[PDB]
Symmetry: C3
Subunit: 152 residues, 3 copies
């Protein structure tokens, strides 16, 4: 029992160092292309791509396209869009049923920040969503190229 | 019921936990190297990281502060050399955190404390044009006071 | 008796913190790799995003604590190919035949244990191609070390 008690104390020291070092590296990592909000992390690839390609990049990376579910998350996302000065794609679309936007899971939206008059399915062909530098949303053609931002 | 068995069970758990920590330590060390390549430099307990682009002092300062750090503030020859590596790699002079905006001729850190280290280029600081309150570090590592409105490489320290 | 019990709850608590750290670390690891890195096995490839001549690229990787990309299998080669395709730029590998023409080796001097030469390669075209580049199609080509190619290191 003496040895065990001694080992445990040793582990505490190792863990304290890791937590401290990790805390520092998290800040370093997020600068300047990431944003942490709650338990979510948004990170931009810094370039533009059409929706399908953007979606694949995020999913293959173990995440998904930016999916702001609250005003706080939307503002965090807006910071990256503003930094790059490029509107970005969100993960949501109404490709399945026109007029009904859903997350990749199929769940209906729990938050939205549509610009006045949007979504309007302009030209009868806008199933994707973009977020502007002002944080507002607009449905847009999925074939258009927008800033790639994933969430993890 | 058997104290010996209870101790053995705890031993088993401690061994497993110890394994987890050893694995994490090795994985974290590798990740640190990956993170620092190619825009970061670690010196002592400080880490310098560049954003890869230029901005005027005010915007550069806000970027670093909002990221939870501050503009590069080399406090020794060792830290200066580390920062210089990034400046050289990007071939772009960078802003430091220090200014003499409060009292002309007296440079201080964001906290207000006076410099504990300096590496001024010959003849600097010279407050050229009577309007240079910020500081830039050249690819040769030397410092020069510069107009804060000018754009220089953004490098933060964490 | 009571000691083992107190040590128990102490271990239980510490394990909780480690697993929380493990969870946070796993998340930041994914974030780190997006979009300039690729993990394969215990190896991690990461591109600097810019091109450089061989010597300069090699120094960058070594000074960073790693080495130039050195795919030792089809799986590692495929992972590396992803970064090349994503950046749409051929990249230098670590291997060269600078010591003995026609014989490519890793920085340690060991002979290749895997290769993926494109048709007709290596051909030492021009009479001086001692470095190696990987194309977007994953195939290899010996290239003049003085040429500039995408910098990709492995850690
Ligand atoms: O007196 C003029 C000389 O030609 C002087 O010019 C250079 O020095 C510059 C100095 O580098 C800059 C910077 O300090 C601006 O941030 O300000 C100036 O304009 C001069 O003071 C250099 O050639 C000196 O050797 C020379 O003395
Ligand atoms: O076109 C009629 C009005 O001028 C209308 O124009 C703007 O609205 C446009 C939308 O922004 C746009 C967007 O939804 C595409 O993804 O589709 C359109 O072409 C218009 O609906 C704006 O000035 C409106 O205020 C105005 O009503
Ligand atoms: O580095 C030079 C290249 O190997 C080039 O050499 C020759 O010109 C041919 O074999 C080409 O098909 C090949 O692509
Ligand atoms: Ca539709
Ligand atoms: Ca639609
Ligand atoms: Ca619209
Ligand atoms: Ca002044
Ligand atoms: Ca001044
Ligand atoms: Ca000056
Ligand atoms: Ca040769
Ligand atoms: Ca050759
Ligand atoms: Ca060739």
């Amino acid at each position: 029992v003496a040895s065990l008690r001694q080992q445990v104390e040793a582990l505490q020291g190792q863990v304290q160092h890791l937590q401290a070092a990790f805390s520092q590296y998290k800040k370093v990592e997020l600068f300047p292309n990431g944003q942490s909000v709650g338990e979510k992390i948004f990170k931009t690839a810094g370039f533009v791509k059409p929706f399908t390609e953007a979606q694949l990049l995020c999913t293959q990376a173990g995440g998904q396209l930016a999916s702001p579910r609250s005003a706080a998350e939307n503002a965090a996302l807006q910071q990256l869009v503003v930094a790059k000065n490029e509107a970005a794609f969100l993960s949501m679309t109404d490709s399945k049923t026109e007029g009904k936007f859903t997350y990749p899971t199929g769940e209906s939206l729990v938050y939205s920040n549509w610009a006045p008059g949007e979504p309007n399915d302009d030209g009868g062909s806008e199933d994707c969503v973009e977020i502007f530098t002002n944080g507002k949303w607009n449905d847009r053609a999925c074939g258009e190229k927008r800033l790639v931002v994933c969430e993890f």
